[PDB]
Subunit: 361 residues, 4 copies
């Protein structure tokens, strides 16, 4: 359906052609979305509202590593492969984003996928899969084994470039953000440093924040929206965040850490305050600084960290793309009823468009 710009939300900067992480060439994204059952939750039987999102930095047939660096806003969550990134500045294989109860199954399934897809001599490189989570506990049977190995293989094999589906898909299927429906969002910026252009792409799996704090384009919007509070069986019940950054800039690992640390500023623009139990994390990678398996790293150009013109263009790109990806998520996610007949509303489009038109005539 509509994305945030289509409802009149303004943003700064110049988006890429897709306005998605796949504006960084060669990046592929895949989702498997598991939606089954209704009514009361029984552990092991559903209902299920869960899934997995796969990002292949260099595409699904690559055996090469990408340069990478991370940041932690609040570390109450899981993201595997990160000790590796901190130490050697690269990771091998895809990124998986999923629900908390699925981490182990996804991790082993990625290994199994490797056995089937990678030459035996290269299997040593496939030992530390990258798997991250947020908690779909209200809408999903977290502990009930709803995600299968076949679901994971389907996302790995089905991933592609081009437009990325947003909203209640893949790892975002069962999520809740700012008390509205959570999910997947994505955005990009094409940034200028003199005559050089680079792309910064961002994808988020959003399960964080309170309605009372939410800002969209600087507007504190929770109180301006009427209704759309969550429910349980019919009774109004009220009233973590994963960030993946891709760039084609040829950055070294410590420079990618800097990129990842900018995500918090974009999160801050939209009002949340990093809950004590909210696992909020960012991972950044370069698709031009690539490390062939067992060979010399390929760094086709080099950027000085004190070159403010280039670095600030890249940093502003991360902030803006993060800010927009978060709003794109909210708009893409539709109302859902899941486990225990819990109902969470998508942010209402008609009301958002009306508020945006009043604020930005």
């Amino acid at each position: 359906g509509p994305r945030a710009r289509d409802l009149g939300v303004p943003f700064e900067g110049t988006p890429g052609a897709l306005n998605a992480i796949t504006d960084v060439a060669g990046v592929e994204v895949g989702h498997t979305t598991v939606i089954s059952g209704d009514g009361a939750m029984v552990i092991g039987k559903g209902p299920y509202r869960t899934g997995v999102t796969i990002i292949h930095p260099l595409g699904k047939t690559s055996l090469d590593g990408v340069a990478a660096g991370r940041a932690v806003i609040n570390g109450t969550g899981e993201w595997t492969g990160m000790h590796l990134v901190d130490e050697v500045g690269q990771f091998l294989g895809p990124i998986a984003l999923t629900g908390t109860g699925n981490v182990g199954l996804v991790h082993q399934s990625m290994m199994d996928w490797s056995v089937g897809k990678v030459p035996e001599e290269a299997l040593f490189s496939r030992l530390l899969p990258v798997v991250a989570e947020t908690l779909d506990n209200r809408l999903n049977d977290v502990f009930g084994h709803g995600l299968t190995r076949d679901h994971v293989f389907a996302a790995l094999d089905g991933a592609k470039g081009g437009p990325v589906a947003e909203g209640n898909v893949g790892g975002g299927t069962g999520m809740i953000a700012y008390t509205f429906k959570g999910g997947i969002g994505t955005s990009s910026r094409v940034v200028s440093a003199g005559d050089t252009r680079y792309t910064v792409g961002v994808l988020v799996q959003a399960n964080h924040g309170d309605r009372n704090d939410l800002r969209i384009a600087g507007v504190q919007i929770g109180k301006e929206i009427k209704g759309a509070w969550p429910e349980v069986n019919g009774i109004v019940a009220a009233g973590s965040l994963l960030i993946v950054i891709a760039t084609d800039a040829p950055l070294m690992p410590h420079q990618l850490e800097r990129m990842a640390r900018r995500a918090a500023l974009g999160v801050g623009r939209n009002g949340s305050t990093a809950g004590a139990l909210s696992g909020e994390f960012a991972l950044a990678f370069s698709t031009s600084h690539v490390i062939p398996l067992g060979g010399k790293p390929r760094l086709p150009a080099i950027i000085n960290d004190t070159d403010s013109e280039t670095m600030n263009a890249l940093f502003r790109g991360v902030v803006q793309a993060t800010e927009e990806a978060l709003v794109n998520q909210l708009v893409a996610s539709e109302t859902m009823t899941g486990a225990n007949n819990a109902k969470v509303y998508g942010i209402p489009h008609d009301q958002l468009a009306r508020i945006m038109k009043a604020r930005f005539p």
Copy 2:
């Protein structure tokens, strides 16, 4: 004079009585402001637009440490005593905030002050002074020895509780923020968890950001303000024509060091609200301390109550307090800082009060 709220800027949460870092009882703040000379800069001769700000966590006569934790947004800058804070979760003595060229002088002056104020038996504890900087390079002769030991002593000895002066004072004297006049700002929040209340106080020394990114209460305001662009000479320096950040957080919550690191990491979200994107060469840092978790010199730490990190009600109240107080301290700074002409006749404008008030009235009727 008016602060941000008085010009009609809305903020979330409940401020303390002074709406300042000194709402955390026992904290003292002092400034020495050095403004002398006009015209062309000659290194070693001025003009000078610099100073130093002192924060005594437990007051100027305390020999005790405070529990502490820090966070780095972008580390292109200096803040001494921080390896100590990372290792042992406490620091001794005051925090000094100053201009980049003054760091060594301030560091040695704090040691000299200790020799005169601390019993010789306790001097061992005074070896790692806490000194942080931002760069006053457009308005000040950075390398020219404008700050003296006497200026540092005056701020150390003159510090007090009560209202805190903001704007072009102390370490903020020569600073520039969002292309407007930079300086010192402060704010506080009184936060609740069940029947318990705590105060979170914030003081900033702001020298960061670009006009085009600035948000005040969510409003992207730089293009709505007419004029007030800097001048380099007699002609317009930025925008159309030619015709670092230090954050100190105090709380009376009885937090352990790793919990204060969490508090410090919330400052970035408050900075983010106001639109900047952490420049490559901008040293943006946060330090948080507790005034109830105190470590008597050579004795047993005093931790009068203890908080679970997974107690979201308590922790989120504290975190939200940091975010909101940081957001407001930054806007308070801009409002307090007046237009200044300094070295090389560079002129930087205070954000115009009349225009800001008008924009806020139109936006928040």
Copy 3:
């Protein structure tokens, strides 16, 4: 059987009664050891030389957290739950130490175990299991699903206090250290901090280092031992005569330390590792995790900190730090002595450090 001290190896300090991590009261350890098959490796069909080691910091029935802090020597490996430890300074549930290929299975199995053992209202707290690995790739079919959920449950349920089995057991089953057989080792120290004596216990899963660098009690011993280099089908595979016929450190203490203080403890492990000569290989995932059994966090309640220690109290802190260094040093040697010769996948044969030669060298050096 003999441990390192019984072969004449001298160490500094005073061990606890068991000279093991279980000298810290209430800690329980369990192993499941999986050894099946011989000969050529086919992925999914073994041979298997693998397993899992479980450490319950407060015992298997506890729902409470322990204060914790970690350190990284070289981060090329996996240890889950560590973001949590860095952020909030505690973890819930047990520590699992296993082979690299088993991480996901163990992580999901720990969740399944919680579903069976923990009240539904407490399940929220069981979402970030702590699982760490070293790579058994020479002796084991890593990718071949040799470890099952039932193996994990058996270690979780079978864990106990008292003496801890060392050597080729649990997560250490298929490991190789200093080009000799690797595995599990443990040691403890009781350390005098003024009028109070604390216990520091250490358990290692050792899969690191080279024979040429190994020091035992300061003696560079690799060249003093004759033979015992690894083989394949009777042909020496490493060392001068070739061709011819990661490290996980777990520290427990009963000292009532805050999380940042436990990070300091964990950072001392590297010095104990250093004593024994290794240099942290580029691909060697070398990690330490320290926890307190007296600073405990009841689930959804107020942390219990029964006493408090000043970081600048060098008498207390240095006693604790020296304990970590000495217990780590000895745990590493205890591992080598406990681990016996093994032939595993692809007919790789790795020798236990020879007891007779070690004892002879120690007697000559330390009469």
Copy 4:
């Protein structure tokens, strides 16, 4: 005079020609040594036993940065410029190593030196000087302004390549290590990374450790040496007969490493320190800084990275890491051997480790 090898101490690996940090081409080192007064200490009036050591990574006329990374063993100390290193992976200007009381004076003096040596257009780059300390509190009047701006300028301007003076010089003048006289030590290794041989150079300012823990070439040597415990006016002040009659590590390499790779190098220092027995005291500020002299960043220009190394290339990386461990181990022993007995403030007398006894013990152990 004899260095450690000349007294019979064995070490592993191959030193560079000078066995010093200046085996990395282009590095310059200078010292200013301040020794005045005897007897009772009065703050502001000595006695003084202090100084400053300067390391210019690319020589004293360079305006360029070097790639760099750091590590902390125990952070109770000061080292400026390190937030910069962590953030952007480089630093500008020289490294100064000094006593704790001198940090501020040295920091401002380095800025003043820049005003006099650097074009005004480049001054922006000189605002984050790198200054580190250890505490000379037993032998020196720390707070008494013994070090002057002129002393700092003399070390900055006098620095040179070639042999590096060790012992009671520069920043090490008033230091104490392993209950013997502390000071400056240096060593290097040339390491074979396939077909390329890189140099790793290490300089230490040692003020850490206890005699009871000291190991030299693995030998626990404190109880083997007779006498030489510190004194005050002829009465022994420490050890069993008492009453009767921080660490800075600087690593240079010519390997073209990226900043995160240099952090890995710096983290290896701890293993070299561990070999020699210390346990990182609670108040001991123990720090390492590593830089590359081939990966250089011209001021306001494009970084120069003449070749690039894969972190997972264990052959190359392990050669470099082993170089750091071995050079750090040897630098520490070289310091002890270079430092002579000194009596300083408050009549504190600290002995250089005795050469005759050390040589005798080494001969017995390594015949």
